[PDB]
Amino acid sequence: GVQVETISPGDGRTFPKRGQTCVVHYTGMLEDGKKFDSSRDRNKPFKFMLGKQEVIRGWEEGVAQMSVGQRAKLTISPDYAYGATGHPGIIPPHATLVFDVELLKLE
């Protein structure tokens, strides 16, 4: 599944609701410690809407547990990410993913 470990606290009262757009910055790393992506490196905050099946399960459920301003480490098992397939070119087969995520604001 997905384990959420807080790095820095959010406001503790503003959690994402389906229908809201979450705006975040993240760095994604594999088990071997290699970075597979960073919105910070691309200088482009990642935005997604809960309940629209637009992100992996680990994100859908993990980012949901975060309050605005929170920074947390999400550790996602392959069944909650890309499974056996992975995503050739960025994520290998059966990969456990670790995302350092910061919930900036809700739009």
Ligand X SMILES: COc1cc(C(F)(F)C(=O)N2CCCC[C@H]2C(=O)O[C@@H](CCCc2ccccc2)CCCc2cccnc2)cc(OC)c1OC
50 or 56, CB closer to ligand X?
56
What backbone torsions phi and psi does residue 64 show, to the nearest 5 degrees?
A: -65, -35
Is 80 noted as a catalytic residue in this protein?
A: no
Member of 13, 34, 43, 53 binding ligand X (CB under 6 A) = 53
Q: How far apart are CA 33 and CA 7, in angstroms?
A: 18
- Torsion over CA: 44, 57, 50, 101 (sign): negative
Task: Give residue number: closest CB to ligand X.
Answer: 55
Member of 30, 55, 64, 104 binding ligand X (CB under 6 A) = 55
Member of 10, 22, 25, 46 binding ligand X (CB under 6 A) = 46
Residue 18: alpha-carbon gap to chain centroid: 16
